[PDB]
């Protein structure tokens, strides 16, 4: 149920990271996910290489 | 002997490392030969 | 460890003397604290040899079967009489088969 | 190699093996209509399978343990 | 439906595997530079330029 | 005897020559290689290609268009050159059908090779193919339907054709959204056939579904220093004047004086001339000024003093697009303010797309010019999206010009081939065999379409042939689940012009290639 | 996935579905922020700079 | 795998190389520190001689290749 | 991943490897070339070939025999080598039928190439050919006529 549980490097273990003040904007993870998935689909829709 | 349209395809993209390795030395010599061309036979005879 | 002292101009003879003294003390300490059993019990010597063989073997690709090979090695060695000549223990390598298929011939 | 879908056929055969205790259910390569290899008389020696597994495991371990290459 | 379609060419599979291997190699290259405990990389281009 | 196989040599060094069987073998090999390469990129389930350039920069290109694949390769087989140029011309005529025509020509030439191996003279094959082409063209023309009279039916046909065109390309992931976008963009042309009026801007970053058709117009230029960045109820003047150190066009003129005071006077006179020109421009009562050429510092400052936007260096395409979208007149003289028309739009402002800034023309007057913003994760994805959108726009424009439509999915090819077979079995001689080979190639086209999807192409093609022979003239390949369906209900439609051009070009190229019995090559340079 | 015998088109559509579900999950996991909350901006900048 | 046209050093190898370069630069000028230090003769393969004790001058005249040694020279 | 299209190189200098479609293409090209070479020497109106030797002897040999033609040629395509050995063994077993067997094998392989192009697994083709060979053998045996009794 711990929604904000993350890797803690200061204590070398695992704990809540909001108390460690480790936050990032949503439009970093969301953008990375969307771009990576779309690039993966584009790569998957490929079956040949041609040299000019 | 058919299939003359080889279309080497995947071949180069896996060997362009070695191709460029040879091409770099070829070009490196090429500057030397091109430079010495303007003197070695450009006006030697005349 | 002695490189930093070498770089700063320490005379190497001092380093050599320190090494000799430390090594002599360490060898004497090893001889003093080494554990030995004064009973010559056949079971105890068997177990000691097996444990030493297991410790020696537990770093190689046959470490999974280290108990099997250790027992086999102890059995092989004990049947040498007094000289423990290596040429009296033949080793044959036959391709194909699991490691456990290896056997000791009496 | 027989043209069938690998994942689907394998999953179905494994599910059938789990359902009824019958380790003879395999891949119907010849399309005889049944997966029962005992009924299809597909028989292999136990020693062969044991040697296959043992040799593969030992060589995989040996390859995994190598971490340095020193070709000239 | 039985045997089904037979993959005659098999070169598209090789192309896809090559693309996947290249992408995975690139990720493993830039894999150790991630997170607070990630180190930097030094790149020397064809010229004498150096960037860390 | 022969030129090459003669006791004396009649050629220069490096010259070559190939007789009947050898030239035929070379031509057929080249054509089949081209057809095999281009195919597998045909139909909804066709995959793309990677075009890795061998040049210094080594440009990378991921594409599905047959014309772009064929033009960006090193082709040395002359028959392959003929096929490549046929594909290029097909692309020039209409935006879609390059892969189809290439594959049809390749299959026709394969059947021709088989017939030649069966000891049939090439002229017999040519005559049979001419008859088959006539029959197929007549059948296709009789199978066409027209919905240009009905507005809603025409709109639905346009939507279906755009969807069918975009089905094969990478945009099939958002086919519905991109089909609506392309249909609206083409409809905004108000019947004009110019695709240059539709600008496509490729901006990196963002999802492919983030692409949109702008309700107004977007310009990638910049405003002057002291000019407003936002105006309301714009009154736009589009100009094509110098506005840059404007020199009197008397080329032989020069300044010859005897004192620097006179030089200063002449300099002030030039500045006053430029100021008077700016005053004449402002006499039109404008808010935004768009010039095709550069605007230098003094005119820009003068415009800023009057509070007038001055967009500079908008090229010929830019000024044409602004004139189309706002209704202005591209002027070059400002002595008759009452004889010029000023463009109007509701609002002009600067918008942020990605990390760049663009000028947004919103609430335009006419709007007969579109800008489409394309967003993608890679430059290759953006390029392929632009190419696919160009194909869709070309096909939609052709359908707007000629509203006749035919059903795709192999229905048109199957009915063509059925008519060809009906003609073939009624004709005696080996011309019947040639026509049967023609019908076989026409069958092979949807066969390749089904193979690309991994379906049972033989069974599906047999079912299609049976349906078309019985009388079901609308049966085709339903690729949703791999069965046959009615293309009328399924909404799979293709332009009649595209299909007719594909058929005729393929027949023409096959005929010209088949006639060749000797290839002679000059010494390469 | 490909070695198991899955066509590289079911994979693309499945990846798209997973991407949509993941965007929904990330959106549900996010927290609203206002630019007047200087502490959150400082934390975001510090998190960005932690790895450099 | 990477197919990058060049060399790659990773882990302890590159760190040891950097430390070696820095140590070589330090040992170049370590002998010219303190009053009992001594100057150096520098010849530029044309016949020009620069007798100097300044560390900055010595590191400036020398032509260096490794990036870490260059970092120390600029320092 | 393929043995040749892999980031690592697993072969000695000069070693080669052709996968499914490339190997099938090479085999079919070799077989068709051999079949088209040996044919036109078949039937009552078949013609002869001239076999010029490239060696020091440069022996001249004009012949109509298929086995003789296939023996004295430089063959590097391994499938062509298989067909040549088939022809040689056929000549050893019985005097005639070398050209017929070579042409039949070439035509069968051409049909196999067409079937493979039609997306049919080669094992299905092999099973069908086994059944067809059984049927053809039975029919040919039934069609035989024996006249050993009457002199
Ligand atoms: N102090 C920290 N403790 C734990 N994780 C962190 C910390 N700082 C950054 N991260 C994590 O490191 C990840 C990678 O960020 P970074 O290494 O800067 O490169 P990039 O942002 O380009 O991935 C982020 O997803 C972030 O969650
Ligand atoms: N959704 C679809 N269903 C059935 N057939 C289609 C569909 N989309 C395209 N096709 C068919 O694929 C063929 C090739 O179209 P496409 O690959 O888009 O362009 P090109 O004609 O340049 O190859 C067309 O003849 C068309 O009949
Ligand atoms: N007089 C003939 N009429 C019709 N066919 C013939 C005649 N003579 C031979 N043939 C056919 O020619 C074929 C090839 O025979 P030939 O070329 O002599 O030897 P091989 O069987 O080695 O090719 C045989 O299958 C035979 O049926
Ligand atoms: Mg040890
Ligand atoms: Mg298309």
- Which string of DSSP letters, residue by residue, matches C36-102? --TT--HHHHHHHHHHHHHHHHTTSTT-TTHHHHHHHHHHHHHTS-SS--GGGS-----SSS-GGG-
**Residue I72 neighbours by CB distance under 10 Å:** 13
* F449, F474, F493, best to mutate for ligand 2 pocket (most atoms within 8 Å of CB): F449
Q: Alpha-carbon distance F217 to H55, whole Å?
A: 64
Distant-in-sequence, close-in-space partners of F418: CB < 8 Å, separation ≥ 6 = F139, F439, F465, F468, F469
Whole-number Å distance between alpha carbons of I61 and F7: 22
Cα separation, F460 vs E45, whole angstroms: 57
Nearest residue (CA) to ligand 3, atom 13: I43
Angle value at C-alpha F23, between F18 and F29, nearest 5 degrees: 135
Mention every residue, 6+ apart, whose C-beta is less than 8 A from residue F247.
Answer: none
What is the C-alpha separation between I32 and F434, in angstroms, rounded? 24
Report CB contact under 8 Å: A42, F170: yes
E-assigned strand segments in F299-421? 309-311, 343-353, 356-364, 370-376, 404-407
Interface test with F, best of I39, I106, I119 (most F CBs within 10 A): I119
Distance CA I7, CA B5 (A): 26
β-strand pairing of F288-291 with F404-407: unpaired
Calpha distance D66→I109 (Å, rounded): 47
User: What is the signed CA dihedral for D31, D32, D34, D39, rounded to 10 degrees?
Assistant: -140
Q: How many CB atoms lie within 10 A of CB I103?
A: 19
In whole angstroms, give the CA distance from residue F352 to residue F359.
9
* Beta bridge partners of residue D71, listed in sequence order: none
Q: Are F112 and F35 in contact (CB under 8 A)?
A: no
Q: Residue F288's beta-bridge partner residues? A: F236, F309
Task: Report which of C40, C36, C34, C43 is spatially closest to residue C74, judged by C-alpha positions.
Answer: C43
Alpha-carbon span F336 to C81, nearest angstrom = 127
Q: Minimal CA–CA distance to F75: which of F109, F35, F30, F41?
A: F30
* DSSP annotation of I63: E
Q: Which residue of B has its CA nearest to F50?
A: B9
Q: How far apart are CA I145 and CA I147, in angstroms?
A: 7
Pair C58, C69: CB distance under 8 Å: no
By the CB < 8 Å criterion, does D4 face chain E? yes
Q: What span, in angstroms and rounded, lies between the C-alpha atoms of I69 and I90?
A: 14
CA-derived radius of gyration, chain C: 22
User: Are C and I close enough to touch, i.e. 3+ CB pairs under 8 angstroms?
Assistant: no
Contact F374, F211 (CB under 8 A): yes
Q: Strand, coil or helix: what is F117?
A: helix
The 10 Å Cβ neighbour count of residue H69 is 21
SS3 assignment, position F123: helix
Give the closest residue to F179 by CA, choosing from F399, F365, F378, F486: F399
Residue F286: which of F246, F321, F326 has the closest Cα?
A: F326
**3-state SS, residue I88:** helix
Q: Which value, in Å, is the radius of gyration of the alpha carbons in chain E?
A: 20
Cα–Cα distances in Å, from F246 out to F66, F210, F273, F299, F314? 49, 44, 9, 11, 18
Question: Could you tell me which residues come within 8 angstroms of residue F402 by beta carbon, excluding any fewer than 6 positions away?
Answer: F495, F496, F497
What's the rounded Cα separation, in Å, for the pair G51 and A28? Answer: 15
Q: Are E40 and E33 in contact (CB under 8 A)?
A: yes
Instruction: Give the sign of the dihedral formed by CA F400, CA F405, CA F408, CA F413.
Output: negative
Give dist(CA A32, CA A37) in Å, integer: 8
How many C-beta atoms surround the C-beta of residue F117 within 10 A? 10
Give the other-Cβ count within 10 Å of E28's Cβ: 11
Chain G residues with CB inside 8 Å of F454's CB?
7
- Measured CA to CA, the distance from residue F315 to residue F323 in angstroms comes to 12
What is the spatial distance between Cα G14 and Cα F40, in angstroms, rounded to a whole number?
Answer: 23
* F297-308 residues labelled b (16+ CB within 10 A) or e (exposed): ebbbbbbbebeb
Residue F169 φ/ψ, nearest 5 degrees: -80, 180
Q: Does I8 touch chain B (CB under 8 A)?
A: no
In degrees, to the nearest 5, what angle opens at C-alpha F482 toward C-alphas F476 and F487? 25
Q: DSSP secondary structure string, B4-38?
A: -----THHHHTTHHHHHHHHHHHHHHHHHHHHHHH
For residue F370, list its beta bridge partners.
F198
Can you give D8-60 as a three-state secondary structure string? HHHHHHHHHHHHCCCCCECCCCCCCCCCEHHHHCCCCCHHHHHHHHHHHHHHH
Can you spell out the DSSP letters for I107-120?
HHHHHHHHHHHTT-
Pick from I41, I44, I86 the residue to mutate for probing ligand 3's pocket: most ligand atoms within 8 Å of its CB.
Answer: I44
What Å resolution does this PDB entry report? Answer: 3.0
Pocket of ligand 2 (CB under 6 A): F 42-44, 46, 66, 96-100, 164-165, 167-168, 408-409, 449, 477, 479, 492, 494
Distance from CA of G20 to the nearest CA of F (A): 12
Which residues, in sequence order, are CB contacts of I70 under 8 Å at separation 6+?
A: I34, I38, I83, I84, I87, I88, I98, I102
Q: Is C59 annotated as a binding residue?
A: yes
- Rounded to the nearest angstrom, the distance between the alpha carbon of G51 and the centre of ligand 1 is 6
Ligand nearest to the CA of F47: 2
C-alpha distances in angstroms, F223 versus F228, F372, I81? 8, 22, 77
Residues 6+ apart with CB under 8 A from C98: D50, D51, D54, D55, D58
- The answer to whether residues F172 and G9 touch, using CB atoms and an 8 Å cutoff, is no
Q: How far apart are the first and last CA of chain B?
A: 52
Residues F318 and F219 sit within 8 Å (Cβ to Cβ)? yes
- Nearest C-alpha to atom 12 of ligand 3 is from which residue? I43
Q: Are B5 and F25 a contacting pair, CB within 8 Å?
A: no
Q: Where are the beta strands (DSSP E) in G1-52?
A: none
């Amino acid at each position: 149920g711990e929604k904000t549980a993350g890797i803690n490097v200061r204590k070398g273990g695992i704990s809540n990271i909001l108390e460690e003040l480790v936050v990032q904007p949503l439009l970093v993870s969301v953008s990375a996910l969307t771009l990576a998935t779309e690039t993966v689909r584009s790569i998957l829709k490929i079956d040949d290489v041609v040299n000019t | 002997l058919a299939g003359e349209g080889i279309s080497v395809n995947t071949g180069p993209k896996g060997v362009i490392n070695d191709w460029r390795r040879f091409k770099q030395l070829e070009t490196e010599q090429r500057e030397e030969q091109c430079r010495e061309m303007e003197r070695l036979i450009k006006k030697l005879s005349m | 460890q002695v490189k930093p002292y070498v770089e700063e101009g320490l005379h190497p003879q001092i380093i050599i003397r320190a090494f000799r003294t430390a090594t002599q003390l360490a060898v004497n300490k090893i001889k003093e604290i080494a554990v030995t059993v004064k009973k010559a019990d056949k079971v105890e010597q068997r177990k000691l040899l097996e444990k030493c063989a297991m410790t020696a073997l537990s770093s190689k690709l046959i470490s999974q079967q280290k108990a099997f090979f250790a027992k086999m090695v102890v059995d092989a060695v004990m049947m040498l009489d007094d000289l423990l000549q290596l040429k009296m223990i033949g080793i044959k390598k036959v391709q194909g088969g699991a490691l456990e298929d290896s056997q000791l011939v009496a | 190699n027989s043209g069938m879908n690998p994942i689907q056929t394998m999953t179905e055969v494994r599910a059938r093996q789990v359902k009824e205790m019958n380790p003879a259910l395999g891949i119907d390569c010849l399309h005889k209509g049944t997966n029962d290899m005992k009924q299809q008389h597909v028989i292999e020696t136990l020693i062969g399978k044991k040697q296959q597994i043992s040799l593969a495991t030992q060589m995989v371990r040996m390859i995994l343990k190598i971490d340095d290459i020193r070709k000239p | 439906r039985g045997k089904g379609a037979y993959q005659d060419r098999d070169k598209p599979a090789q192309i896809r595997f090559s693309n996947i291997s290249a992408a995975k190699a690139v990720a493993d290259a830039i894999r150790t530079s991630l997170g607070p405990k990630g180190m930097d990389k030094m790149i020397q281009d064809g010229k004498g330029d150096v960037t860390i | 005897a022969s030129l090459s196989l003669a006791p004396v040599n009649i050629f220069k060094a490096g010259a070559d020559e190939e007789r009947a069987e050898t030239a035929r073998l070379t031509s057929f090999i080249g054509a089949i290689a081209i057809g095999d390469l281009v195919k597998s990129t045909l139909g909804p389930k066709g995959m793309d290609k990677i075009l890795l350039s061998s040049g210094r920069d080594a440009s990378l290109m991921v594409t599905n268009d047959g014309a772009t694949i064929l033009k960006n390769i090193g082709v040395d087989n002359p028959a392959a050159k003929v096929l490549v140029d046929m594909s290029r011309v097909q692309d020039d005529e209409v935006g879609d059908g390059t892969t189809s025509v290439t594959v049809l020509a390749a299959e026709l030439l394969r059947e021709a090779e088989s017939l030649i191996a069966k000891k049939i003279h090439p002229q017999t094959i040519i005559a049979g193919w001419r008859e088959a082409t006539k029959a197929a063209r007549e059948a296709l023309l009789s199978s066409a339907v027209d919905h240009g009279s009905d507005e809603v039916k025409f709109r639905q046909d346009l939507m279906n054709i755009a969807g069918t065109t975009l089905s094969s390309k990478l945009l099939t992931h958002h086919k519905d959204h991109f089909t609506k976008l392309a249909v609206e963009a083409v409809l905004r042309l108000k019947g004009s056939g110019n695709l240059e009026a539709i600008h496509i801007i490729k901006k990196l970053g963002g999802s492919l579904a983030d692409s949109y058709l702008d309700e107004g117009f977007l310009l990638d230029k910049k405003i002057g220093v002291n000019q407003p960045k936002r105006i309301e109820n714009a009154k736009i003047l589009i100009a094509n004047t110098g506005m840059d150190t404007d020199k009197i066009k008397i080329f032989g003129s020069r300044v010859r004086v005897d004192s620097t005071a006179k030089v200063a006077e002449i300099e002030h006179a030039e500045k006053e001339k430029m100021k008077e020109k700016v005053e004449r421009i402002l006499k039109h009562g404008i808010n935004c000024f768009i010039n095709r050429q550069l605007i230098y510092n003094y005119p820009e400052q003068l415009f800023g003093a009057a509070g007038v936007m001055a967009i500079e260096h908008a090229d010929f395409a830019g000024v044409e697009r602004l004139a189309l979208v706002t209704g202005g007149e591209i002027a070059s003289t400002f002595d008759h303010p009452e004889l010029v028309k000023l463009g109007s739009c509701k609002l002009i402002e600067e918008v942020m797309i990605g990390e760049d800034k663009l000028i947004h023309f919103s609430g335009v007057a006419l709007g007969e010019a579109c800008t489409i913003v394309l967003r993608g994760a890679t430059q290759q994805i953006l390029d392929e999206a632009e190419r696919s959108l160009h194909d869709a726009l070309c096909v939609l424009a052709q359908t707007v010009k000629d509203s006749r439509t035919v059903y795709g999915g192999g229905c048109s090819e199957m009915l063509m081939a059925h008519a060809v077979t009906q003609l073939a079995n009624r004709t005696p001689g080996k011309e019947a065999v040639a026509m049967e080979s023609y019908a076989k190639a026409l069958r092979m086209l949807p066969t390749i379409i089904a193979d690309n999807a991994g379906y049972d192409s033989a069974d599906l093609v047999a079912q299609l042939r049976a349906a078309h022979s019985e009388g079901n003239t609308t049966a085709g390949l339903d690729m949703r689940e791999g069965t046959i369906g009615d293309m009328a209900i399924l909404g799979i439609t293709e332009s009649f012009q595209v299909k007719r051009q594909v058929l005729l070009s393929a027949a023409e190229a096959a005929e010209v290639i088949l006639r060749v019995d000797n290839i002679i090559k000059a010494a390469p340079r | 996935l490909l070695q198991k015998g899955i066509h590289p088109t079911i994979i693309s559509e499945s990846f798209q579905k997973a991407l949509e579900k993941g965007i929904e999950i990330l959106t549900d996991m996010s927290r609203p922020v206002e630019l007047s909350d200087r502490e959150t901006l400082l934390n975001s900048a510090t998190t960005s700079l932690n790895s450099k | 795998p990477l197919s990058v046209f060049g060399d790659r050093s990773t882990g302890e190898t590159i760190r040891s190389q950097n430390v070696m370069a820095a140590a070589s630069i330090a040992n170049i000028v370590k002998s010219s520190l303190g009053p009992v230090g001594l100057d150096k003769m520098l010849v530029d393969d044309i016949g020009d001689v620069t007798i100097t004790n300044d560390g900055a001058t010595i590191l400036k005249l020398l032509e260096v290749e490794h990036p870490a040694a260059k970092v120390l020279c600029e320092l």
